[PDB]
Structures are given as C-alpha cells and as structure tokens.
Design a protein around this ligand. Structure first.
Ligand code: HAS
Ligand code: HEM
Ligand code: CUA
Ligand SMILES: [Cu+]
Lengths: 166, 552, 33
C-alpha cells in the first residue's frame, strides 16, 4: 500500500506515454499524407512576395477589377483578389469549376481574413504581402467569402462572393 | 501576520487587483455570448456603461482584462508566493512591491486609452491597426513587471541552494523556477516587437510596421503565454489539490518532468498560430506542428499523474470500485471542486487544441467561433476556476478572515454554474465554428448572415444567462469575503495546505538530472533559435513596413 | 493497492475524445477538399 501503488502508478505511466507518443506519430503521418495530396494546395505559398499596399489599386494586377482573373495554364486561372476595408474586389469573383484557381490576395489597408465558406481556403491577407493559395472547385454555385480577422467596425459585414461556373 | 510574512500582503495586492480586472472584463462576457446567440444586448449595456462605444471596444476590454491582466497577476501571486512559503523564505520585498507598482501603473496607463476608445485593437493588437501610444507603453510596463518576478524567484532559489549545498530543489520551487525561466525566454518575442516596432511607431518615430514580422514576434510569445497562464494552475493542481482531495501527489518526478518539458517545448511552436499566414515556409510549419504535438505530451502526463492522485485520494476516503473513488471525494469543498471540474472541461479543451495543431486541419477552424470554444475550456474554465476555488484556502491564509458555511455553499453554486455555462458555451462555439461562423464578429448586427447556426445559437444565449448569474454571484460572494470584519490571526499564520509526495528508489537519479536547470535552460534557448532563427533572419532581411490605420 | 483503474478510465475518455475530435475534423477537411 502507498509504496505498492507507487510502482504500479509509475509503470502504467510509462505505458501511457508510449501509447500517447504512438498516437501522436499516427497523427503526424496522416498530416504528412494530406501534404502529399491535392488538398495541400490551400497552404499559402512560402516565398515572400512584397507589394506596396498604398499603390496596389492604382497600378499593377490589382488596379483593374476587369483584369482580376487570368488564364495562366490550360486549366489554371490566377485570380488577383484585393480585400480592403470592408469588401472584396472583384465582387463577385467568377471562375470555372474543375479548374485550378490560383488566388493571389492582398490588402491596401489592414489585415483581413479570406475564408471561402464550404472550402479549405482560409488564409490571412497581409497589407504589403501576397497570400498565394491554390484550389480546385468541384461543385459549382455561389461560394460566400467571409472576413474572419477583425478589421474594424465594419468587419462583421465584410462578405464576398465566388462564382464557379458549371 | 504582515511584518514577518510581508510577502503575504504583496501577494494579496496582486490577487485583489487580479480579481477586479477579472470582474470588469467578465461583464462583457454575457453580452458577447448573447451576440453569438444572435441576440443584440448592447444598447442595454451601452445604457449601463455609457463609455462603451462598440462591440469591439468591449471585446478588447474582455480580452485584455481577463487573459492578460487577470492571468498575469494570478501567476505573479502563485508563482512567487507558493515557492516563498515552501522554502519559508522572504522574497526581496523591495523588488516585490516594485513589480506590483509597475503592474498597477502599467494597468492604469493602458486602461485610460482602452476606456477612451483610443485603442480598440483587441488583445492581439495586430498592426497596421494603430493604437494610442499609452496602450503600448502601458502594456510594456505591465509585462516587464514579470521580469522583476523572474528575478525575485531566481534570487530565492539561489539563496536556498546556498544554505542547502547539493540538495535537490524542492518541488514547488522547482516548478516556479522552470516556470519563470520559460516565461523569460518566451517574453523575448513581444519585448522585441514592442521595443523595435510598436513603441517607436505609436510615438511617431517611424511611420510603418511590417505586419508579418510583427505577428511572428507576437506569436513567439503568444503561444507560451497561455502556458504562462496554465502552469500556476498546474502548480496548484499538483501540490495542493491532492491534499484538498484527502490524498497525496503520487509522483514528484512526474510533476518535475511535465514542467521540464514545458520549459523545453513551450516557446518553439508559435507557427501553429500562423498556419494561414503567407511568407512562412510550409516545412517550418510542419516542424512547428510536430513540436506542438510534442508540447501536448506534458499535459498528457499531467492528466494521468493527476487522475491517479485523485483516485488514490478517493481510495483513502473509502473508495469503491471502478467509479467509487469519484463519489468519495470532498464534493462539499469548493477548493476541491472548482479545479476538478476545470479539469473535466479541459478534456474537450485539449482535444480541441490538438486538432488546431495539426497543420492542414487548422484551415477548417482557423479564426472561427471554434477557437474561442477551445480556449474558454482552457483559460476561462480550468485556469479561472482553479483561481476561484483557491480563494477558499488562499484568502484566509493571507487575511486571517475565515469562511462561513453560507459563503462555502455560495461558492459551490458559483463553481457549478460557471462550469455548466462554460460547457454550454463550448458546445455553442465549436458548433458555430464548424459552421464557419467567424470569431471577433458582431454577428447579431447582421441577423440574416448565418441562419444555418440556428440551434447552437440557442446554447450561446443560454450560456450567457447562466454565466451572467454565476458572475453576479461570484461578485456578491467575493466581496462578502473581503468586506467582512471577521478576523482570526491564527489561520493567517496557518501553513498552506501543501500535499505530501509519494517517492521511491528510482527517483534520485532522474530527479538529479532534472535539477540541472542551467543546462536545460540553455537547451531550451537553443531550440528557440533553431525554430525561429532561420525564418526571422529571412523576414528581417526583407522588411516591408506599411502605414497605420484606425478603423474605429 | 493496485492498478489505477480509475486513472486509466480517465485517460481512456481523454483518448477517445481526442479521436472523436481529430478524426471528426480530418473528415471535414477532406469533405471541403
Ligand atoms: C489557457 C488556455 C490555453 C491552453 C492551456 C491551450 C491548450 C492547447 N492549445 Fe490553445 N491553440 C492551439 C493548440 C493547443 C494545444 C496543442 C494545446 C495543448 O496544450 C492541449 C493539451 C491538453 C491535453 C492533452 C488534455 C489534458 C487534459 C487534462 C490534464 C485533464 C484530465 C482531467 C482529469 C484527470 C479530471 C478527472 C477527474 C475526475 C474526478 C474523473 C492551436 C493550434 O495548435 C490554436 C490555433 C487556432 C487558430 O487557428 O487560431 C490554439 C488557440 C488558442 C487561443 C487563441 C489565440 C488567439 O486569440 O488568437 C488561446 C487564447 C489558446 C489558449 C490555450 N490553449 N489557444
Ligand atoms: C463570464 C464568462 C465569459 C463569457 C460569457 C465569455 C464569452 C466570450 C465570448 C462569447 C467570446 C467570443 C467573442 C468574439 O469572438 O467576438 C469571448 C472572447 C474572449 N474571451 Fe471570454 N467569456 C467569459 C470569460 C472569459 C474569461 C474568464 C477569460 C480569460 C481569463 C476570457 C477570455 C477571452 C478572450 C482572450 C477572448 C478573445 C478576445 C479576442 O478574440 O481578442 N473570457 N468571451
Ligand atoms: Cu476584413 Cu474583418
Ligand atoms: Cu498556441
């Protein structure tokens, strides 16, 4: 008693640790798995891509809303999105489904969230940096974009729309 | 009581200041819970509190007061006082009162801008959102207060090592030491952010700040800071709870190992808060993901060590079968209850965290109402409750004021309510999160935005009312305890209810290794440079400062 | 006395919850893929 409870307690403790490390390594494996699949596109690009947030909507690929989408491969379209204080340009965003859309998103003011409801596109958008994410839409219809990073009084009302043509 | 234990006073002043903060912050809680239940209660609050300007001014105040002011002041209380009484040594009093004044001067200075709607930027304060200088200077001085606290404890520890040459650091002190060292390393992120960017910016020395480096440096501190909130509660759970339960801490070495591992892995994991950030390598994120998974381990041990100790306790109290030991615990004692329930909610809390920390899985819930669901089970539940229950032994010990049967049952209501509410809220927030409902959002001002969350919006309403009532009862009781002129001096000079430790033969060699703190602190410091070094070097090379904005 | 059946009980609940959560969201991740 007490001392007999010590050893047993310490024994099952070692077993518990062995098991807990093993379960965590299983998790580590299943994540690595997704890192090898298509679904891994949603991870923002690692390389820094610096822009001017004060000159963003006056020159360059974000200046004209009409030029926002660009066919850049046989089934690849790059969309230049701009999330700004309380909205998203272009609105709505139009893209074909079964095509790989490569978003390149920035802001001219402060930090925004870009969260496409129903997908894995959830990225932070930084003033003076480009958030590059890759995704394929498999279902067509109107996907709603939400700002999920506090950006000011009008943050709760900052919504956008992605249009993926069947 | 104060002249030979003057540490007793200073410790009370931290705790009082800390419980005021907690109250003022918590007021906004109910309203936010209602807001997430699609009910707009703010014109009512704005009537009551005419200074409040926005939902977001409220949210700033709720974060800062609770998760920053309350939690720090409670750690500065426990993680100085508990070692002091174990060692039976006096902390450098000159230094102790200096740290209190800093925390108080700092709190007032920052408050003035917060209350003046001059820095509605939330507790994260992400640039380019530009707050009033006195917010940043106030925060600084508030957080540097802990650098005095580090010193204080190291001083105590050195001095004890001198009078006991070659003896192993006692348990609590060991916890306190690795604690304050870990915080020291961890604080370096935020201090740099402040010193290099946020201070000169707010003062107007510069006109821009890079958001990417700013939030990187932020999170270097950002993650460990939550451990900084957790460990003072862990210290109480490991060394006082088992005595409140009627048993013993079943392993000294385990507790040491848990804490050591926190020292090691607390800081080098910040990228799990930046999974959705650009300009950071996906490999570095996978790495920080794995180390994050590892930082789970310490709490996994904690869970067994602690559940054993309470089973054992339950057993001595005449425990029954598989579940008998549960019923034989002192459920009439709020000091036992509060932290046990906290631990219950911590199970769903942890599972939440591990999910968040799985890299690619973060995209499902990042910035959604799930995240606030996660952390109210951690900080607002486990930490706060252990903090609340602990008044039942700590307040008397400090003041000599007893606790009547009424106040004991009052507490019991408060404790159960707070726990039920939080649980109810947790179901709400997680559910809403999976349903893509964002956080930091005044969503009751756009009622038609999220119809798909009909039913978990009910829970959020329900929590808000339950937790309102619990809050008012807390204030009523807490003040009933501090405002009574009942005093027994002899219970003020009653030793803390530290728990006995069970110890075996194998301990010696393992504990000995763990008492090589200087070596472990250098190991920990290296891990920090290995994880953050390569990336910080890369951002600092390519600084792209953008100008400030005020959007409130 | 003996085996910490109670503690083992607790860590089982903990483990199971973790799996509910982890596997649950791992599904939702692919569902939104
Ligand atoms: C004080 C509160 C804090 C704790 C503690 C905490 C725990 C974890 N978290 Fe977290 N967290 C994340 C990962 C983790 C992980 C892996 C853990 C782990 O430490 C959890 C370990 C816990 C366990 C492994 C469970 C142990 C269970 C125990 C010990 C209880 C057993 C009960 C017993 C024995 C009682 C039985 C008794 C009887 C009588 C039967 C991640 C991702 O990796 C995010 C990013 C989300 C995003 O995208 O923004 C995150 C988000 C947050 C935020 C949002 C920050 C913001 O505003 O931006 C806060 C404030 C926070 C606080 C805390 N968090 N966390
Ligand atoms: C009275 C009980 C409480 C209630 C009803 C409550 C409710 C809430 C709700 C619904 C949110 C989400 C607000 C949003 O995302 O816009 C929130 C945010 C938050 N709560 Fe609480 N809470 C309570 C207590 C606490 C406590 C005790 C703490 C810490 C000690 C705490 C820390 C936080 C933090 C850090 C945030 C995040 C603010 C931010 O995102 O910047 N809460 N609270
Ligand atoms: Cu943009 Cu919130
Ligand atoms: Cu974290």
């Amino acid at each position: 008693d007490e001392h007999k409870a010590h050893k047993a307690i310490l024994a099952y403790e070692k077993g518990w640790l062995a098991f807990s490390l093993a379960m965590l390594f299983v998790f580590i494996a299943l994540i690595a798995y997704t890192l090898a699949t298509h679904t891994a596109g949603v991870i923002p690009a690692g390389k820094l891509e610096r822009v001017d947030p004060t000159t963003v909507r006056q020159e360059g690929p974000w200046a004209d809303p009409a030029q926002a989408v660009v066919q850049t491969g046989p089934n690849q379209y790059t969309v230049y999105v701009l999330a700004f204080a309380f909205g998203y340009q272009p609105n709505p965003i139009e893209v074909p489904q079964g095509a790989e859309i490569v978003f390149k998103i920035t802001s001219p003011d402060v930090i925004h969230g870009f969260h496409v409801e129903g997908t894995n596109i959830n990225v932070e958008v930084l003033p003076g940096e480009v958030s590059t994410v890759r995704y394929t839409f498999k279902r067509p219809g109107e996907y709603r974009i939400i700002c999920n990073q506090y950006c000011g009084l009008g943050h709760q009302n900052m919504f956008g729309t992605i249009v993926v043509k069947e | 009581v104060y002249e030979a234990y003057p540490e007793k006073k200073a410790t009370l002043y931290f705790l009082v200041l800390g419980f005021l903060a907690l109250i003022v912050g918590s007021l906004f809680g109910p309203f936010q819970a209602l807001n997430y239940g699609n009910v707009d209660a703010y014109p009512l609050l704005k009537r009551l509190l005419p200074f409040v300007q926005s939902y977001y001014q409220g949210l700033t105040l709720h974060g800062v007061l609770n998760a920053i002011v309350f939690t720090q002041l409670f750690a500065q209380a426990i993680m100085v006082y508990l070692p002091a009484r174990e060692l039976n040594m006096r902390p450098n009093m000159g230094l102790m009162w200096l740290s209190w004044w800093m925390a108080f001067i700092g709190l007032v200075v920052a408050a003035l801008p917060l209350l003046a709607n001059e820095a509605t930027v939330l507790y994260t304060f992400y640039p380019p959102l530009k707050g009033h200088w006195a917010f940043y200077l106030g925060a600084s001085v508030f957080v540097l207060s802990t650098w005095v606290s580090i010193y204080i404890v190291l001083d105590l520890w050195r001095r004890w090592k001198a009078a006991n040459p070659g003896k192993v650091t006692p348990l609590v002190t060991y916890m306190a030491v690795v604690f304050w060292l870990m915080w020291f390393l961890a604080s370096l992120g935020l201090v740099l952010e402040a010193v290099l960017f946020l201070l000169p910016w707010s003062f107007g020395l510069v006109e821009g700040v890079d958001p990417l480096v700013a939030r990187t440096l932020f999170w270097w501190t950002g993650h460990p800071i939550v451990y900084f909130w957790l460990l003072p509660a862990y210290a109480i759970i490991y060394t006082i709870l088992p005595k409140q339960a009627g048993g013993k801490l079943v392993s000294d070495p385990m507790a040491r190992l848990a804490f050591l591992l926190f020292l090691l892995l607390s800081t080098p994991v910040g990228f799990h808060h930046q999974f959705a950030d650009p300009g950071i390598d996906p490999t570095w994120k996978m790495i920080h993901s794995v180390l994050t998974l590892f930082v789970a381990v310490p709490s996994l041990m904690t869970a067994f060590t602690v559940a054993a100790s309470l089973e054992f306790a339950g057993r001595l109290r005449g425990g029954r079968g598989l579940f008998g030991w549960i019923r034989a615990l002192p459920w009439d004692n709020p000091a036992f209850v509060a932290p046990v329930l906290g631990l219950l909610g911590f199970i769903p809390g942890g599972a939440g965290g591990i999910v968040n920390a799985s890299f690619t899985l973060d995209y499902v819930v990042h910035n959604t109402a799930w995240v606030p669901g996660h952390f109210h089970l951690q900080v607002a539940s486990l930490v706060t409750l252990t903090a609340m229950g602990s008044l039942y032994w700590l307040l008397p010990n400090l003041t000599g004021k007893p606790i009547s049967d009424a106040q004991r049952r009052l507490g019991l209501a408060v404790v159960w309510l707070w726990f039920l509410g939080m649980m109810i809220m947790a179901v709400g927030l997680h559910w809403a999160g999976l349903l893509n409902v964002p956080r930091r959002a005044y969503i009751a001002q756009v009622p038609d935005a999220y119809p798909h969350a009909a039913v978990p919006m009910v829970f959020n309403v329900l929590a808000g009312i339950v937790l309102l009532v619990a809050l008012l009862l807390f204030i009523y009781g807490l003040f009933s305890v501090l405002l009574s002129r009942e005093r027994k001096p002899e219970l003020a000079e009653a030793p803390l209810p530290f728990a006995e430790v069970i110890s075996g033969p194998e301990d010696r060699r393992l504990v000995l290794a763990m008492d090589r703190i200087g070596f472990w602190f250098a190991v920990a410091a290296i891990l920090v440079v290995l994880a953050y070094g390569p990336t910080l070097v890369q951002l600092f090379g390519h600084l792209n400062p953008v100008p400030g904005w005020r959007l409130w | 006395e003996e085996k910490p059946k109670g503690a083992l009980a607790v860590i089982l609940v903990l483990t199971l919850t973790i799996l509910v959560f982890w596997l649950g969201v791992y599904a939702v991740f692919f569902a939104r893929g």
